[PDB]
Ligand binder design. Structure first.
Ligand SMILES: C[S@@+](CC[C@H](N)C(=O)[O-])C[C@H]1O[C@@H](n2cnc3c(N)ncnc32)[C@H](O)[C@@H]1O
Length: 245
């Protein structure tokens, strides 16, 4: 996970999503005030953080591991006239710089997988006020059994990938009222995640054409689309919205 970041820092989104998905997740939380405190964990370049910026009031704080991403985050915050309430800082997902019950809303798209769904649900709770909301998108199964090929890919990539019923079950455990959940539209993958990867494929494939590692990675990125186009009926990203009791 080194040069890879120099690939993703180009893209406007490092994970599947769309302005519609973020906006729909927002429709399930309570209205916020300019004095609210928001946190987008695993924000990345901040592609979805800015969408969220137009959908809710409050001070948003994006947190990512890689400083190169955070660097672009603020770059965009300033180019959007909202550097005042939209600020990105480098940090970790398993050790957040938040006081207990300081946050009104915890956001996270295609990043919870880094520390485990259940673990994140419980560990992040601490930082949320009573009645506060948490909204995260996560890859999940849509059926009870799927094809071998696709099953392998995930069980190896992310072992905690479970069916939707199981995730919601983990939400109650962590003390969350399972407000809602919805599968992410197919365009979130193809239009907003894959299609943009073609805009920067050639410029890239040139700089690393002779590198074995870089090639196996590129083939990996192309293998994901192949898998999605072939098993878009068995898995995908699911948005989970809950309210801390
Ligand atoms: C799939 S990307 C999604 C980025 C952004 N949420 C989006 O949807 O466009 C995963 C993000 O999690 C970040 N990340 C990985 N490990 C992390 C950690 N330990 N703490 C915080 N962020 C982390 C990665 O750097 C990356 O920005």
């Amino acid at each position: 996970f080194s040069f890879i970041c120099n690939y993703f820092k180009l893209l406007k989104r490092q994970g599947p999503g769309s302005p519609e998905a973020t906006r729909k997740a927002v429709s399930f939380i309570n209205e916020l005030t300019d004095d609210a405190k928001i946190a987008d964990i695993g924000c990345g370049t901040g592609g979805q953080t800015l969408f969220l910026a137009d959908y809710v009031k409050g001070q948003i704080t994006g947190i990512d591991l890689f400083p190169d991403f955070i660097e672009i985050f603020n770059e965009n915050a300033v180019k959007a006239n909202c550097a005042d309430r939209v600020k990105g800082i480098t940090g970790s997902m398993d050790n957040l710089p938040f006081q207990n019950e300081e946050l009104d809303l915890i956001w996270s798209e295609g990043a919870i997988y880094n520390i485990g769904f259940e673990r994140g649900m419980n560990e992040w709770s601490k930082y949320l006020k009573k009645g506060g909301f948490i909204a995260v998108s996560e890859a999940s199964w849509f059926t009870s059994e799927r094809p071998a090929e696709i099953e392998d890919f995930w069980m190896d990539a992310y072992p905690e990938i479970s069916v939707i019923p199981t995730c919601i079950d983990k939400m109650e455990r962590a003390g969350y009222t399972p407000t809602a959940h919805f599968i992410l539209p197919e365009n979130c993958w193809t239009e907003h995640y894959f299609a943009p990867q073609d805009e920067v494929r050639e410029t890239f494939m040139k700089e690393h054409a002779g590198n074995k590692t870089a090639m196996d990675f590129m083939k990996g990125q192309q293998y994901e689309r192949s898998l999605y186009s072939k098993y878009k009926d068995y898995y995908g990203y699911v948005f989970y919205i809950g309210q801390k009791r």
